[PDB]
Design a protein around this ligand. Structure first.
Ligand code: K
Ligand code: MG
Ligand code: MG
Ligand code: MG
Ligand code: MG
Ligand code: MG
Ligand code: MG
Ligand code: MG
Ligand code: MG
Ligand code: MG
Ligand code: MG
Ligand code: MG
Ligand code: MG
Ligand code: MG
Ligand code: MG
Ligand code: MG
Ligand code: MG
Ligand code: MG
Ligand code: MG
Ligand code: MG
Ligand code: MG
Ligand code: MG
Ligand code: MG
Ligand code: MG
Ligand code: MG
Ligand code: MG
Ligand code: MG
Ligand code: MG
Ligand code: MG
Ligand code: MG
Ligand code: MG
Ligand code: MG
Ligand code: MG
Ligand code: MG
Ligand code: MG
Ligand code: MG
Ligand code: MG
Ligand code: MG
Ligand code: MG
Ligand code: MG
Ligand code: MG
Ligand code: MG
Ligand code: MG
Ligand code: MG
Ligand code: MG
Ligand code: MG
Lengths: 68, 96, 197, 49
RNA sequence: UCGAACCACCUAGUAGCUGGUUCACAUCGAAGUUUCCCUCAGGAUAGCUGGUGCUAGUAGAAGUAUUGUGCGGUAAAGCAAAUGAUUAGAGGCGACCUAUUCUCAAACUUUAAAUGUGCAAACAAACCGGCCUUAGCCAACUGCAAGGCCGGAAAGAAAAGAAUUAGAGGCACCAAGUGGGCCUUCUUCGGUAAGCGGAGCAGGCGAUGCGGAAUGAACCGCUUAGGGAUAUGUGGCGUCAAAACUUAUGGGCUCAUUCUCGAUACGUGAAAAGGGUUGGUGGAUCCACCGGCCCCGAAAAUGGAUGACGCUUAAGCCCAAUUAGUGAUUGCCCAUUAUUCCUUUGGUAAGGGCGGAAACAAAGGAGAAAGUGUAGCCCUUCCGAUGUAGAUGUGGCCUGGAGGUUAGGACGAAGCUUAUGGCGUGAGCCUAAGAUGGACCGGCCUCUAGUGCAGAUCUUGGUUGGCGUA
RNA sequence: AAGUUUGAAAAGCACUUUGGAAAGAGAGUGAAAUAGAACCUGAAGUCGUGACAAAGACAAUGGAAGUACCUCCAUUUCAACGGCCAGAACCAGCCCUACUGCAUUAUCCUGUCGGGGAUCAAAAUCCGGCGGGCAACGAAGUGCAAGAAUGGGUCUUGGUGAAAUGAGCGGAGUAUUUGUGCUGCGCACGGCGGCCGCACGCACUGGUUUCUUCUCCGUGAUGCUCCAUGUUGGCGAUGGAAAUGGGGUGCCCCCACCCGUCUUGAAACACGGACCAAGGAGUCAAACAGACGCGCAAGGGAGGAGAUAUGCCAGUACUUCUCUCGUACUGAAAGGGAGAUGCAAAAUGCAUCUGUGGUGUGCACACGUCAAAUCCGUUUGAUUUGCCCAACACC
């Protein structure tokens, strides 16, 4: 026998029971994979240099603190 | 119906202002049983022993605009066999 | 009536008592509930909550990790001050990958025999919480630590391994069975390794 | 309605009620009515002129 | 016993289908929709729900506004504007051109709403001047791009209507039921229509009583721990039936002779066309026109329905009041709603006390546990309480046996009987009596299971109305 | 199908009598015959009999609240004493009453002149000008309202002072200071084009006291919690007593469709449903996963078997190698196989080994600072800096 085909009667109520959650903020999950490659490669070189600078900065802080 | 409040119609009381005069007065319903039981002054006044019995109450507030009154009885409620029968309304406690 | 639709969804599930059957755990809970109620330090309150927590949420810690974090704190501490006491609400286990350690004072619910031997041989002391309550009633000059929870096999198994961007392990006893279709491009299709979120 | 609670919440209520009684006095009412009518009539006439 | 005999066995054959499925309270509480399936009386999958939590407790919040800035082609409008239809006259000249003219379009449009929809409105951010790096751009750089370091400022967001919150954000794990829906308000498609079939937004019934509409799953009011008092909602105040014992010192209209005027929200009777009273526009010197109430138009099958009687100085219809040109503000009646008081139970619950202050013989008293859960350690305070399918909790109840511990019994164990009371919200527990019985058995902590019945055309035994009847 | 399960022991009912007999009535055995023969206990359902309650025809059953009658039930009381029933008084709280001032009035009020109307002549309804204004009786159907210094109800709440926090109780004064009225200067406000007005606005807590009104002090817990205290009558003087709760039956007024089930929808002209007893349905094993409890931990643990306490004991006590899961993954396979820092740039580079590979956000702790509260000892919040544990994101 025939039956109901389709309806959207109760769906809005179901979606709002646990609410419609907002988006993740922009500073999270901001991966750069798939972007324009030439700019991606150049940015990798700068980040490698910055890590070496960070290590050097900590050593100087330790030596200065020990000297009081 | 709500059985813990009773409605009483009094002769010559036909307005709401008339019914206000009787708020707080004592009310009695008199009937008889089948056997002689204990009463007030059972031993002091043996002449009172009888099958006659009474239930007491008080007037609480008026009812409607025509002089009907609401009555509350001490403890239990008045029996349904008293519908359409005589009720006594005394003049005490007196405010005059 | 009052319109309080969806008000039960703001209730939170928190444990108020322990499920443990250990009388010594019960004694410690009694002592630190008293301290948390009657003092003004956050250390006692945190210790009381962690004592209430369950075994799976009290992951053990490594002696090498303790040593590393203690050194990283000590490099920026004046030489006229004493090193803090490491405090773990859980178990401390030995580490064969690190042989040389400094003298440390550690308080924990339980020590393995190897860890106790290593600490004593290095020249430290192993303390219990009743001793700690007398040495530092308010938790002054301490270092609260937790063990690692990620890296457990159950955590590695959580999730569906057939959706794009997922790298969870499937529940299977035969390692070589669930290859081919759905995991290789040559067999119909391959699950995508990456997906933007 | 409760006297002690009202006084506890507002200590100036005694002065307010004294002023209210003074206003509700009869001779004060009559004198004020006559004086106010005279003042307003004179002011309006002067403003017009 | 035959469109494939009978007997035993494989066989407790398989069933997406029909029937059944045994104690109590407490905290929460749905779906008939999406995608795939030899799928359409079934599954898997997401959604809705419960349990368990983790994390720095006001955080990365919002089914709502305001201001700023984007998106749109429905309603309406138009054909004297493009496309497509379509009536008539006129001028130039039968045809054609030229301006008009009458009527239009879900698959036509120049224009274009109301309700909508995206983004932003200072704390991992944005703003203003150092320095470092790049194998990036440019003819070059001290120009642009990118990642960092140093420093400053910061009504922490003024004033102009210049937000608000019974406004703690985020992250996981395990799993149930459901996957036949139906009704109503606005918008609609098919159909002559349907208590018909199919959709969009929202609210309901299902899963839910209570108070009203006489009666009704869905209409009106309101939504539910156990009870009082006060006051209201919808609906009412001639009797039935509580309230104007038929209120007013308010105004008008209406007469209905066999389904017997009217008092029918949803809704559960009535058209074109016509004519007794009471009103209103125009025209004369009495005529047309159009309103109120009433009447005709108006024919069925058991005897009957404003709910019944009845009502006509209404107890009918339209307005309008609250004790009445006298003095200014609430006539009365009825709820599982509102306010308030008492008691219970559970919290995302909020606080206080817990080193025995001192003293005290009979012939002021007791208690005072560092505590999830009890006969709750004690006291104060605030908030919630309904619920099918379903989930979970309970120093929650009951039955046969085991390891311990502590008792009872011939001065009477188990079992059985009850107008035997007492206790507990309840499952149940305990006492009394036997003018019953004659030999075993209770409480508490753990362990264990063939562990709780009202119905399955349930099994076995007994009984029974029909019946002193056929 | 069916326990011959009487009783300790047959001591298994001699004898009298009524009856054809079966049996009945007596007598006797036995602790019991209510143990009399297939005999322990002897339930439910159904039936007989006696006593009682009543009762129309609303099928019966059911709910809520009373009453009449009964009660082999429980508890309480019986003397300057009640834990029973009533009345009145006062206290705290709550509820509902009476008592009311400030603004406003003009399309208004009242005279006079004119015209207008009507009459029998008038007046009045109505329309212009001009002059005065408060419709003020409880003026007004009008815009707000704060009037209890201090009338009744509470069988709708607790109490009789075992903490009374009081404008109310106590003490001392009997004067303060709220408003009304009048009024000073400066500012503000309105009108005109600086002067004129100010209904009485702000400041000087401006002056005056004519009216109006009370004002000021006081009791911590050395009480952690619960219970314990008035007045006047009736009943109760130990009884076959009174009283209060339970329990039973009838009656009155009101309320109230038959359970279980499939279903969008059941009470239904949808199915299963005469009564009772006993029985009757999520179990056992294996593989995996999650939550929770316990032991050990870079290790954890067997199993099979043996050995001797051990020859009461299918238990407990003891044991080696080994085996298994894990500490390392990846490729079809031949195969290969994961630290950090510094110098440097070698087709296996070199050197050290107390150490998070880096950045952002991130408990507690340490160093400062600022708020609010404080019994002045300290608390509750924020924030700066350092290290950041667990964890998340980007490399
Ligand atoms: K005149
Ligand atoms: Mg369907
Ligand atoms: Mg790992
Ligand atoms: Mg044959
Ligand atoms: Mg079977
Ligand atoms: Mg079969
Ligand atoms: Mg099927
Ligand atoms: Mg079924
Ligand atoms: Mg709920
Ligand atoms: Mg197929
Ligand atoms: Mg079916
Ligand atoms: Mg249109
Ligand atoms: Mg248009
Ligand atoms: Mg056109
Ligand atoms: Mg503003
Ligand atoms: Mg189905
Ligand atoms: Mg249909
Ligand atoms: Mg259903
Ligand atoms: Mg409803
Ligand atoms: Mg009707
Ligand atoms: Mg009546
Ligand atoms: Mg007419
Ligand atoms: Mg009729
Ligand atoms: Mg009719
Ligand atoms: Mg009616
Ligand atoms: Mg409560
Ligand atoms: Mg509930
Ligand atoms: Mg058994
Ligand atoms: Mg009985
Ligand atoms: Mg069974
Ligand atoms: Mg049974
Ligand atoms: Mg016997
Ligand atoms: Mg027998
Ligand atoms: Mg029987
Ligand atoms: Mg005049
Ligand atoms: Mg005084
Ligand atoms: Mg019924
Ligand atoms: Mg059907
Ligand atoms: Mg049914
Ligand atoms: Mg039918
Ligand atoms: Mg069937
Ligand atoms: Mg091994
Ligand atoms: Mg060897
Ligand atoms: Mg591994
Ligand atoms: Mg290999
Ligand atoms: Mg390969």
């Amino acid at each position: 026998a025939k039956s109901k085909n389709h309806t959207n009667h109760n769906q809005s109520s179901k979606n709002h029971r646990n609410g419609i959650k907002g988006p993740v903020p922009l500073h999270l999950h901001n991966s750069k994979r798939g972007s324009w490659l030439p700019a991606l490669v150049n940015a990798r070189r700068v980040r490698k240099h910055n890590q070496k600078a960070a290590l050097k900065k900590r050593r100087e802080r330790i030596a200065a603190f020990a000297a009081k | 119906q709500t059985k813990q409040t009773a409605l009483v119609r009094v002769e010559n009381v036909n307005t709401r202002e008339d019914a206000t005069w009787y708020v707080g007065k004592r009310v009695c319903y008199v009937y008889h049983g089948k056997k002689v039981k204990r009463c007030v002054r059972w031993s002091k006044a043996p002449a009172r022993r009888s099958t006659t019995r009474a239930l007491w109450g008080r007037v609480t507030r008026p009812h409607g605009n025509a002089g009907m009154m609401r009555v509350k009885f001490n403890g239990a409620s008045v029996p349904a066999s008293a519908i359409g029968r005589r009720i006594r309304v005394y003049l005490y406690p007196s405010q005059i | 009536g009052v319109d309080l639709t969806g008000i039960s969804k703001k209730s939170r599930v928190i444990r108020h008592h322990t499920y443990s059957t250990n009388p010594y755990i019960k004694l410690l809970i009694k002592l630190y509930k008293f301290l948390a109620k009657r003092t003004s330090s956050g250390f006692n309150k945190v210790v009381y909550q962690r004592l209430i927590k369950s075994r799976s949420n009290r992951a053990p810690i490594s002696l090498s990790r303790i040593a590393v974090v203690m050194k990283r704190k000590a490099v920026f501490t004046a030489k006229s001050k004493a090193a803090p006491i490491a405090v773990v609400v859980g178990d401390v286990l030995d580490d064969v990958r690190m042989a040389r350690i400094p003298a440390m004072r550690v308080c924990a619910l339980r020590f393995s025999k190897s860890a106790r031997q290593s600490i004593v041989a290095a020249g430290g002391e192993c303390l219990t919480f009743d001793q700690l309550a007398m040495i530092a009633p308010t938790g002054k000059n301490t270092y609260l630590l937790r063990g690692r929870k990620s890296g457990r096999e159950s955590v590695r198994h959580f999730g569906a391994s057939g959706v794009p961007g997922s790298h969870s392990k499937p529940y299977a006893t035969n390692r070589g069975k669930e290859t081919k279709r759905g995991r290789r491009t040559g067999r119909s299709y391959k699950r995508k390794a990456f997906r933007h979120v | 309605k409760n006297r002690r609670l009202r006084l506890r919440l507002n200590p100036y209520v005694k002065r307010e009620t004294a002023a209210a009684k003074g206003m509700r006095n009869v001779a004060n009412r009559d004198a004020r009515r006559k004086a106010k009518l005279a003042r307003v009539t004179k002011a309006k006439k002067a403003a017009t002129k």
